[PDB]
Scaffold this active site. Structure first.
Site, PDB file in Angstrom:
ATOM      1  CE1 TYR A   1       0.933  -0.621   4.470  1.00 20.86           C
ATOM      2  CE2 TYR A   1       0.302   1.681   4.397  1.00 20.86           C
ATOM      3  CZ  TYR A   1       0.911   0.628   5.045  1.00 20.86           C
ATOM      4  OH  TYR A   1       1.504   0.817   6.272  1.00 20.86           O
TER       5      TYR A   1
ATOM      6  CG  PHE B   1       0.006   8.283   7.411  1.00 19.57           C
ATOM      7  CD1 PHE B   1      -0.815   7.907   6.361  1.00 19.57           C
ATOM      8  CD2 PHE B   1       0.143   7.426   8.489  1.00 19.57           C
ATOM      9  CE1 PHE B   1      -1.482   6.699   6.391  1.00 19.57           C
ATOM     10  CE2 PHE B   1      -0.521   6.221   8.522  1.00 19.57           C
ATOM     11  CZ  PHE B   1      -1.332   5.857   7.474  1.00 19.57           C
ATOM     12  CG  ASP B   2       2.790   3.915   6.421  1.00 17.95           C
ATOM     13  OD1 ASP B   2       3.483   3.307   5.584  1.00 17.95           O
ATOM     14  OD2 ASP B   2       2.657   3.537   7.604  1.00 17.95           O
TER      15      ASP B   2
ATOM     16  CB  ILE C   1      -6.347  -0.060  12.286  1.00 12.77           C
ATOM     17  CG1 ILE C   1      -5.755   0.305  10.906  1.00 12.77           C
ATOM     18  CG2 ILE C   1      -5.638   0.732  13.380  1.00 12.77           C
ATOM     19  CD1 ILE C   1      -6.109   1.700  10.435  1.00 12.77           C
TER      20      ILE C   1
ATOM     21  CE1 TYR D   1      -2.052   3.590  15.497  1.00 12.95           C
ATOM     22  CE2 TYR D   1      -2.300   4.767  13.432  1.00 12.95           C
ATOM     23  CZ  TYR D   1      -1.685   3.791  14.183  1.00 12.95           C
ATOM     24  OH  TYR D   1      -0.697   3.015  13.618  1.00 12.95           O
TER      25      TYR D   1
ATOM     26  CG  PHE E   1      -4.481   2.871   4.039  1.00 11.32           C
ATOM     27  CD1 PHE E   1      -3.192   2.981   4.506  1.00 11.32           C
ATOM     28  CD2 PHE E   1      -5.527   3.087   4.915  1.00 11.32           C
ATOM     29  CE1 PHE E   1      -2.936   3.289   5.814  1.00 11.32           C
ATOM     30  CE2 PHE E   1      -5.280   3.394   6.236  1.00 11.32           C
ATOM     31  CZ  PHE E   1      -3.982   3.493   6.685  1.00 11.32           C
TER      32      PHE E   1
END
Lengths: 241, 107, 421
Positions: free
Chosen positions: B26, B36-37, B56, B82, B99
């Site tokens: 992803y 963020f990722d 999650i 979160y 994502f």
């Protein structure tokens, strides 16, 4: 105290800075200028298609770039770097714009779902037809001749805009304008024109790369002069009356 | 919930079973287009079996709502993400996540 | 009418190239009629038609000629690549001629020789350019090394044009002389529009056309003989952005004091358009003004809650995004977010009030001007109102509005902190 004030200083996060490296892309257009001045209008409806071969990340990141939806150059300009909207020096950068890349329009990183069945990216062998709408802006396009509804209103066309196409690296595509070079698999629909009426004389039309300042020079650094466009006076052809 | 959206789906029916490493590649995102990722920058496809509560349940439910070779735009929410707590230093409170999920294999 | 030009339907085909006039065409569409026209007007000379042309010095009427100053791209090299000592020499060829000037600038829209931060001269006119006009050397054209050079030690700025040492009216080598080294001089190349150049700093002595004549034996070094790298160059830019706290305007100053208050204003005739962009996004019904003196329209202002992206500083005012959802029909839907104040205003009535919660009412002096948009996905704003005046005290600048710029709650009094500019 070091670990305490470490774990005290970290979770603020308004202090914590951000950086995001971005790919270098490049816009392009054909030699045709719009120049559609009201009063002696030649055409208000154009049509061209963009055939493609490859859009994959060959040794690269998957975050590529390939768009066609026309942007407001009263708000955009062809520079190789800049802009607070995460860069991407191509099409659909400015907020007063959109950009069609298969599934959505991104008006200044604001996602706008374009209405079409089988929403898929500008993948291998998927044509992208263009259509013009000015007076009430509902600027049609089609991907393989399917209804791309939900077109964009309030794109600032106060006057005109420019013909555009953006492409990242790892791209292999073809215009379809006319003659041999436009093999129109989906023809101009009713009230449109295969966009080669303005094949003006003195030169065969071609690409321009959106008035580049300096290509990859090799002999010596050619300080290529300031040129705004075909005409330093304005952006308009001459119907003599 | 996980309002899944397809991008370039493959067979469309090879859904993941229990104890199946979703080899996910992803690129995690937030709203506004703020990244963020990412797994593509790592060249490390993310791996997780179903049910063990590593990730999650946005990933778990979306993967369960997903076939093999299915590029998809997942949309998690603060209840499954979160939430009002937030992964500190990166994630603030009350965040909706995105994502660019692309499941590849299941072992 | 629409003779094959009815854009929608085209009842009849066979559109021609002739629709665009004989400007697009050539005489090939005109051999049939222009010969009969010429026969006609030939026998009209056989009448005795007396008609001299208008655009001729005899019948002196041509008063439509003037220059065009715009996009004077001042090509440079890097400040890090600047020079302070030793002899230096860079060639500058020319593809064209015109409003193009080269030499050596200084780190300091105002072109070469406008101020005390450059040395240059032109081929269009053959005159030095340092804080004025002064004849020198000779004009040039396409295919001409200007051959720019300096000796930084005893200040011998010379220009070896294809080996032709150029001289002033007195017949002396040095164009510029007795100049403080200061903060160094960089190669520079001014080009107005439709003027092209090509420079060779020192990247190859073979690419240096005429260097062995006048650069080699004279101890004059190439500008990048030692650089094992692609030397950088850059230009004075087109879009205006925000980097600098000026504090050197024609007359504008910046201070702060308590309702908040500052000090501002010029006396030069500010016909042109100005700029402003606050530095600190301050944060501790929400009435906070942004006052400016020229109110009740000394010049008509144009207040608009507006984002970053412009490209102009001109009088093209009132020339500024709407979602439209399809459902496989084309009929739009969900059109609530759209175009993502008036030209009335200020300081005879007093103010330009900000208000906040989402919920904005940005009007002048608390009179309802029907604020339309409350569109705010996200906008980091600083108050950038630009407009003209008759120059009376030309500008000013004053929980509260200091509540939707940062994480704390709305609170009225902003406290003492060290940066506020």
């Amino acid at each position: 105290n070091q670990h305490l004030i470490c774990d005290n200083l970290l979770p603020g996060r308004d202090l914590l800075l951000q950086t995001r490296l971005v790919n270098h892309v490049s816009s392009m257009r054909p030699n045709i200028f719009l120049g559609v001045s009201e009063g002696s209008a030649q055409y208000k409806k154009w049509y061209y298609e963009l055939m493609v071969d490859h859009t994959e990340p060959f040794v690269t990141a998957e975050a590529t770039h390939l768009r066609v939806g026309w942007a407001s150059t009263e708000g955009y300009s062809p520079y190789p770097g800049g802009g607070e909207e995460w860069g991407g020096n191509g099409v659909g950068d400015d907020l007063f714009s959109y950009g069609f890349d298969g599934l959505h329009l991104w008006s200044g990183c604001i996602a706008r779902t374009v209405s079409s069945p089988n929403q898929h990216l500008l993948r291998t062998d998927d044509v992208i037809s263009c259509c013009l709408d000015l007076s009430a802006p509902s600027i049609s396009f089609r991907i393989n001749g399917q209804p791309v509804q939900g077109m964009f209103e309030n794109f600032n066309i106060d006057g005109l805009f420019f013909p555009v196409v953006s492409f990242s690296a790892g791209i292999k595509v073809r215009f379809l304008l006319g003659g041999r070079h436009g093999e129109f698999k989906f023809l101009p629909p009713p009230g449109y024109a295969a966009c080669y009426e303005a094949v003006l004389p003195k030169e065969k039309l071609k690409v321009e790369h959106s008035r580049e300042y300096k290509q990859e020079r090799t002999y010596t650094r050619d300080l290529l002069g300031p040129t705004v466009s075909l005409t330093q006076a304005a952006f308009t052809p001459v119907p003599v009356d | 919930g996980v309002e899944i959206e397809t991008i370039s789906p493959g067979d469309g029916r090879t859904f993941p079973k229990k104890g199946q490493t979703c080899v996910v590649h992803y690129t995690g995102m937030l709203q506004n287009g703020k990244k963020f990722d990412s797994s593509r920058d790592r060249n490390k496809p993310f791996k997780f079996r179903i049910g063990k509560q590593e990730v999650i349940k946005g990933f778990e439910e979306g993967a369960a709502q997903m076939s093999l070779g299915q590029r998809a735009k997942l949309t998690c929410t603060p209840d499954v993400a979160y939430g009002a707590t937030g992964h500190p230093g990166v994630i603030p409170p009350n965040a909706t996540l995105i994502f660019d999920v692309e499941l590849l294999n299941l072992e | 009418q629409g003779w094959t030009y009815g854009i929608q339907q085209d009842v009849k085909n066979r559109r021609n190239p002739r629709l665009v006039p004989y400007t697009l065409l050539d005489d090939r569409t005109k051999k049939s009629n222009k010969d009969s026209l010429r026969e006609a007007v030939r026998t009209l000379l056989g009448y005795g038609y007396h008609l001299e042309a208008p655009d001729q010095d005899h019948a002196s009427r041509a008063e439509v000629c003037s220059g065009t100053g715009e996009r004077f791209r001042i090509f440079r090299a890097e400040k890090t690549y600047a020079v302070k000592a030793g002899r230096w020499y860079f060639e500058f060829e020319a593809v064209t001629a015109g409003d193009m000037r080269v030499g050596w600038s200084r780190p300091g829209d105002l072109e070469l020789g406008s101020d005390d931060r450059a040395f240059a001269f032109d081929g269009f006119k053959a005159q030095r350019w340092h804080q004025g006009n002064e004849h020198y050397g000779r004009s040039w054209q396409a295919g001409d090394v200007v051959g720019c050079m300096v000796d930084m030690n005893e200040h011998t700025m010379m220009f070896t044009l294809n080996g032709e040492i150029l001289l002033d009216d007195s017949g002396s080598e040095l164009a510029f002389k007795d100049f403080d080294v200061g903060d160094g001089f960089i190669p520079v190349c001014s080009l107005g529009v439709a003027q092209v150049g090509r420079m060779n700093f020192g990247k190859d002595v073979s690419t240096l056309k005429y260097f062995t004549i006048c650069g080699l034996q004279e101890g004059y070094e190439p500008f990048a003989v030692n650089t094992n790298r692609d030397i950088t160059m850059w230009l004075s830019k087109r879009l205006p952005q925000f980097l600098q706290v000026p504090s050197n305007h024609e007359h504008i100053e910046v201070t702060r004091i308590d309702v908040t208050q500052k000090s501002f204003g010029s006396q030069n005739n500010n016909t042109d358009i100005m700029f402003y962009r606050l530095s600190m996004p301050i944060e501790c019904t929400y009435y906070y003004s942004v006052r400016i003196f020229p109110g009740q329209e000394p010049a008509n202002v144009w207040v608009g809650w507006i984002t970053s992206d412009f490209h102009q500083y001109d009088t093209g005012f009132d020339l500024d995004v709407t979602v439209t959802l399809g459902d496989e029909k084309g009929k739009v839907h969900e059109s609530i977010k759209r175009s993502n104040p008036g030209q009335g205003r200020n300081n005879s009535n007093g103010l330009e009030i900000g208000c906040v919660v989402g919920l904005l009412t940005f009007i002048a002096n608390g009179k309802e001007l029907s604020t339309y948009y409350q569109v705010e996905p996200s906008t980091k704003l600083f108050p950038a109102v630009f407009a003209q005046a008759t120059s009376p005290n030309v500008f000013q600048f004053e929980g509260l509005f200091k509540s939707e710029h940062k994480n704390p709650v709305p609170q009225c009094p902003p406290r003492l902190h060290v940066q506020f500019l």
